[PDB]
Write a protein that binds this ligand. Structure first.
Ligand code: C8E
Ligand code: C8E
Ligand code: C8E
Ligand code: C8E
Length: 404
């Protein structure tokens, strides 16, 4: 998910700054760099995880806070069969999460009138890969995976007269419902979208992933994996447009939205992992999320009986280059403590921008040598993005790999 595109997935990878390319990082490697999967301890792994995110947004004097938690699964298994590793897992996760609720100015119709409309968002994505890793020459490990993605979303966005007009001017907002709803909303209104068998407003695309590894030294590994842009489908499902008059009179139309071109771009990451001491470990990858390679427009069509409304949004997103280092010491044949960091390189309270800086802590507590527990937590370092607004996330994951 991450509401634009970044790096770092997995219980042990999150802890190491989202490094992943060259080394082992559990079954998440299925959605990271399947080649890496080869390094797995002989046998058949079987992890269970609990990924967790939460954002604290503070938009503005006019305070509007975010919180007023979605926890996702991680059933995965990676069987072995000489030189050949085979895995398949489900990987649920949030990333987009806000709940300003109905009380703040985001709920203030033009003319600062308090509507009782909610302002919230939640994008959930469940990746589900099926791939493999292969040992070709105790130096070359190839691996790839093809996953079924299932995106779901629910919004509670409110737009004041102003920006609805702004959307018109820009040549973004077309419709038919517009003419007619104009003059009822007027320079003092606000429109409001609400998505909640009930469609749910979800989609079902496909994802691709292939990567390699090369033991350059016996203390240096080189890695790379290409990530095909996921082919999500169209987000479809019941929704409710509510023209709100310049004084609070609500006109609710019920129809069905269709979000088109929700892009999750491709990415090529390159990294290494050195171990200049049979205890202390270090990792480092450079990621490239190819956003500039997205030229079409995200289209939000809404259809009711009385008519429709549509918003076009062209992409215009340049490339994102993520650099990230990792590390991991072994307190002993029990504890393993890791810690990494990763620097990455339209105020809209309901969809906060990805953060660039990140600090990550974590460790691993083995207790069987056939069972293990990984624990990671990543800090989204605060950025200050008229409407001043700022936020900072806290991601925490925990997986228990019962080496069968
Ligand atoms: C965008 C998420 C998909 C959910 C559909 C809701 C569609 C509603 O409109 C989103 C448009 O937001 C843009 C802001 O308002 C325009 C302000 O003027 C800015 C000029 O760049
Ligand atoms: C997105 C919600 C739809 C509700 C539309 C009400 C917003 C309309 O505009 C208010 C600004 O007034 C000026 C617009 O021009 C008059 C009619 O609209 C025609 C545009 O093709
Ligand atoms: C050779 C042994 C490993 C020693 C540490 C490796 C550290 C290597 O470099 C990592 C570079 O990436 C992180 C830098 O901070 C981000 C700066 O902006 C750069 C553009 O991507
Ligand atoms: C034997 C080692 C002990 C390590 C335990 C790690 C588990 C401890 O907590 C980590 C932080 O908790 C994360 C999320 O909050 C709990 C929510 O409920 C989740 C399942 O529905």
């Amino acid at each position: 998910t991450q509401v634009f595109d970044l790096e770092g997935y997995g219980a042990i990878s999150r802890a190491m700054g989202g490094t992943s390319s060259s080394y082992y990082t559990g079954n998440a490697a299925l959605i990271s760099n399947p080649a890496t999967l080869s390094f797995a301890p002989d046998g058949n792994q079987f992890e269970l995880g609990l990924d967790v995110v939460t954002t604290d947004i503070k938009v503005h004097g006019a305070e509007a806070k975010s919180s007023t938690p979605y926890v996702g699964p991680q059933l995965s298994y990676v069987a072995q069969l000489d030189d050949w590793r085979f895995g398949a897992g489900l990987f649920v996760s949030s990333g987009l999460g806000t709940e300003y609720g109905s009380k703040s100015f985001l709920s203030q119709t033009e003319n600062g009138i308090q509507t009782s409309f909610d302002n919230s968002s939640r994008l959930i994505v469940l990746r589900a890969p099926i791939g493999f890793s292969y040992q070709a020459t105790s130096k070359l490990t190839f691996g790839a995976s093809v996953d079924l993605v299932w995106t779901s979303l629910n919004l509670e966005l409110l737009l004041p007269s102003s920006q609805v007009g702004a959307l018109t001017a820009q040549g973004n907002l077309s419709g038919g419902l517009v003419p007619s709803l104009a003059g009822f909303v007027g320079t003092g209104g606000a429109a409001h979208f609400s998505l909640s068998a009930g469609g749910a407003v979800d989609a079902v695309g496909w994802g691709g992933r292939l990567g390699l590894t090369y033991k350059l030294t016996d203390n240096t590994v080189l890695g790379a994996m290409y990530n095909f842009k996921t082919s999500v489908g169209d987000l479809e499902g019941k929704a409710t447009l509510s023209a709100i008059s310049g004084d609070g009179a609500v006109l609710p139309l019920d129809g069905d939205i269709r979000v088109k071109n929700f892009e999750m771009p491709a990415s090529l990451t390159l990294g290494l992992a050195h171990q200049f001491n049979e205890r202390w470990v270090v990792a480092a990858d450079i990621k490239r999320a190819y956003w500039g390679d997205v030229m079409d427009s995200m289209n939000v069509a809404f259809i009711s009986q009385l008519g429709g409304i549509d918003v076009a949004l062209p992409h215009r997103y340049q490339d994102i280059t993520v650099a990230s280092i990792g590390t991991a010491y072994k307190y002993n044949n029990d504890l393993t403590l890791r810690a990494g960091y990763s620097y990455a390189q339209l105020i809209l309270p309901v969809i906060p921008a990805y953060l660039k800086r990140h600090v990550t802590f974590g460790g691993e507590y083995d207790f069987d040598k056939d069972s293990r527990i990984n624990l990671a937590i990543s800090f989204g370092l605060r950025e200050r993005v008229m409407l001043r607004q700022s936020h900072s996330q806290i991601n925490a994951v925990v997986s228990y790999s019962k080496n069968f």
